[PDB]
Amino acid sequence: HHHHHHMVHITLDRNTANSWLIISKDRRQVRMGDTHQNVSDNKERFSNYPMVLGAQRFSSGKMYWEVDVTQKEAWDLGVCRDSVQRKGQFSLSPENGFWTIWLWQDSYEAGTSPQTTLHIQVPPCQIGIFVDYEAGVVSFYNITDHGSLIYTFSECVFAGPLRPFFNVGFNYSGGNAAPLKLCPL
Numbered sequence: 001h002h003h004h005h006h007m008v009h010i011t012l013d014r015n016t017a018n019s020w021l022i023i024s025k026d027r028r029q030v031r032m033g034d035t036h037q038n039v040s041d042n043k044e045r046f047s048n049y050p051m052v053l054g055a056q057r058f059s060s061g062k063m064y065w066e067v068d069v070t071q072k073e074a075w076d077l078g079v080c081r082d083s084v085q086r087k088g089q090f091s092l093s094p095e096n097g098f099w100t101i102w103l104w105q106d107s108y109e110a111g112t113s114p115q116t117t118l119h120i121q122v123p124p125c126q127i128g129i130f131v132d133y134e135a136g137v138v139s140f141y142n143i144t145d146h147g148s149l150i151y152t153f154s155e156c157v158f159a160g161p162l163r164p165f166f167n168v169g170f171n172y173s174g175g176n177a178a179p180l181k182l183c184p185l
Ligand SMILES: CO[C@H]1CN(Cc2cncs2)CC[C@H]1C
Pocket: 018, 020, 047, 048, 049, 050, 170, 171, 172
């Protein structure tokens, strides 16, 4: 792909984070802690899952960023509406305001309803995410495999400002402690 020139500098919004997440000083890395991280509750925090939003809001234009997923067993990545539900249980779907892919139990899937199987021959260590607001497109790229396409959501109905979306996943196994990291431009 040739989307690299739309690169944006994403930082994580501490206030949106689940209370078990640990965000680095530079706001560019996040991981699951082994306990509550001693923060106050607020209406922005994702309560049920290890999720956090980027601070940036997008309502026009073309945007690109990259995320490092090295040695993780489970994660979700993409974008979401600013107004997504924060509390309780919900599915990641465009109907609920999410445009995402994930790794779970050694398979990759797109967050459609119902979910779509992805075909990835080279397990990615870094994921590229491209958003074209005007066109209604969210695309995912395998940076480890020379930028090959993973998935395109088209005919997206964003219906609001978009925020970068992250889920570090649970660590029930002891094999999923590694962070998500925003990769440098
Ligand atoms: C209902 O979700 C809660 C779960 N709790 C406890 C758990 C942590 N390790 C496995 S369950 C963490 C904060 C939030 C994600």
